[PDB]
Ligand binder design. Sequence first.
Ligand SMILES: CC(C)(CO)n1c(=O)[nH]c2c3cccnc3n(-c3ccccc3)c(=O)c21
Ligand SMILES: [Mg+2]
Ligand SMILES: [Zn+2]
Length: 307
Amino acid sequence: QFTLPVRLCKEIELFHFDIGPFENMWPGIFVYMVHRSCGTSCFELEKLCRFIMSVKKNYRRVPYHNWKHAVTVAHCMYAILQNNHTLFTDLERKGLLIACLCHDLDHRGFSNSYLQKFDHPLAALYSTSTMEQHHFSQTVSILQLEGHNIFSTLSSSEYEQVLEIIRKAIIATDLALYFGNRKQLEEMYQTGSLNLNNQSHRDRVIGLMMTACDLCSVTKLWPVTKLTANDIYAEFWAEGDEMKKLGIQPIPMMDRDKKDEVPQGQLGFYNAVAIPCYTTLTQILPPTEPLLKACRDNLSQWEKVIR
Ligand SMILES: CC(C)(CO)n1c(=O)[nH]c2c3cccnc3n(-c3ccccc3)c(=O)c21
Ligand SMILES: [Mg+2]
Ligand SMILES: [Zn+2]
């Protein structure tokens, strides 16, 4: 039944768009993004709406890895897609927006390292990319619910094609995998061997897009960026608190007693992770340049905080 306001129509297209002040409209914002990416008949409205509300319900009340984070990541993907639409197939356009909304499904607010170290049942189930494999499992589980399968109308080979796009995209949100991925992609771009017709290459490009979307809070306007950083640190500190209880000293980043080091930690995160990510992405997809520009702007803001 929901209809989005006229001011948003043009603003939703921009990379720096902040979903933050529209909580009641987030399910409706996602529906709009889907119709603009693959048409009004791309998914049966009833199916799609059941799927979204179920996905929403399966995001816990954690400070950062919550419903808001899912819609934020999906919106960034929507902007990338819209600015490079002809470069992606209808099946990719569909799969990626769904993968972004589901990428942190049922996150408990603990890193893969925590679950591995403390031998959590989830780490026993999934050896590497612990949470990520759980997020893809949670996505399949939601699709398997009565009248949720938005992909039922696709052909047999086209169905396993989306589920494989989704699987690969969600796994690539494992930051530990990003570093190698970005390195292989930088090699291909420089040597001039990068070929989007090659499937293994497309998988890597998609992988980087997933990282770029996952970290997009660094591409918003400084007041939004700063407020998201508080949410991520509230989540890191809670994890550190748990480690302390179990007689383990957490790394500075997860220690609330080491709050003064946050600007220095951010500067390191932007120099080692965020800037290289958007630099490589801009080389492959030149219309994604505003993401790099906004990231550089926030990097200067963190330097100013240190100074
Ligand atoms: C991007 C964000 C949220 C900016 O506030 N951020 C930050 O400040 N430090 C970090 C950060 C620091 C260390 C490891 N991962 C981080 N990720 C992260 C977490 C899970 C999955 C993928 C990436 C962030 O998004 C982030
Ligand atoms: Mg994740
Ligand atoms: Zn995420």
